[PDB]
Design a binder for this molecule. Structure first.
Ligand SMILES: C[C@@H](Oc1cc(-c2cnn(C3CCNCC3)c2)cnc1N)c1c(Cl)ccc(F)c1Cl
Length: 281
């Protein structure tokens, strides 16, 4: 019998509003144990006065993430459901969403990016470990994208971890046109193989520090371009092993796309290779 982690509302304390749906920073007395103390959390709230299909999506999400336990999957820590507004209590990720974290890194100083190739590869490895998990659990995400991942620290010096964070469109399988495989766009079909297509777009976002896919193309024009068999341009000075990986993720045919195990393999092998190459210089 599926139990959501009921958390005592009076033990929760909201504070800072983050954005819009409605996200607050806050603290929660003892979620992570008895001597847990007042740990910091994020809080997702469902409207007082929202659509009932919003409440249904709200609950379905809450239930979906109850299922997960993985380092690269955002923890849902508690819920406050017996009163409105309902609260979803999530571990706090102080870096905000991946996409913002990347763009700030790019734009801080033209001395250069605050994230190096090795930082960026570790991001890719992290998210890939999470997709391998989702697949092992027979879930398809259907909306992989940096805007949907979260970074654990705000700064660019401290050890960081990225997690897949928003599962509003995930489904059990046991616009955003720029991220969607061509099948998904023509036929409305989604699979774990279309998840690989969007992941390839994702690591392209990471390696360009949060650039817009197909900058040359309006939303309407995008499907035209992909139709052409056209694809993204390589990120500037992208390592050839990584470009090969992405390109393979966007094979026009779904069964020629690599698997997430393979994708994680590729990423760690490259990382190994690159690390070794520097140390024996
Ligand atoms: C639901 C919300 O949760 C969090 C948001 C944040 C956060 C911090 N900052 N910000 C925004 C502040 C305004 N500019 C954009 C980032 C969002 C941190 N931890 C969270 N658990 C969230 C957001 Cl807001 C975005 C993407 C996600 F995948 C998720 Cl899961």
């Amino acid at each position: 019998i599926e139990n959501l982690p009921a958390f005592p509302r009076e033990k929760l304390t909201l504070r800072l509003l983050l954005g819009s749906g409605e996200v607050y920073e806050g603290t929660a007395v003892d979620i992570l144990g008895v001597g847990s103390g007042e740990i910091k959390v994020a809080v997702k709230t469902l409207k007082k006065g929202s659509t009932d299909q919003e409440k249904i999506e709200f609950l379905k999400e809450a239930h979906l993430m109850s299922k997960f336990n993985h380092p690269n999957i955002l923890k849902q820590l508690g819920v406050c459901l017996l009163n409105e507004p309902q609260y979803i209590i999530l571990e706090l990720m102080e870096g905000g969403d991946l996409l913002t974290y990347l763009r700030k890194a790019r734009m801080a100083t033209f001395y250069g990016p605050l994230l190096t190739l090795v930082d960026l590869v570790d991001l890719c490895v992290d998210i890939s470990k999470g997709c391998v998990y989702l697949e092992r659990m027979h879930f398809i995400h259907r909306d992989l994208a940096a805007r949907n991942c979260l970074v654990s620290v705000k700064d660019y010096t401290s050890p960081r971890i990225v997690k897949i964070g928003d599962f509003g469109l995930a489904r059990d399988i046991y616009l955003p046109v720029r991220w969607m495989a061509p099948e998904s766009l023509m036929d409305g079909i989604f699979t774990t193989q279309s998840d690989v297509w969007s992941f390839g777009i994702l690591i392209w976002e990471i390696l360009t520090l949060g650039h817009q896919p197909y900058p040359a193309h309006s939303n309407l024009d995008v499907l035209n371009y992909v139709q052409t068999g056209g694809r993204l341009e390589p990120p500037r000075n992208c390592p050839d092993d990584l470009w090969n990986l992405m390109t393979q993720c966007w094979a026009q045919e779904p069964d020629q796309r690599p698997t997430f195990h393979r994708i994680q393999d590729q990423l760690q092998l490259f990382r190994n290779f690159f690390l070794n190459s520097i140390y024996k210089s």
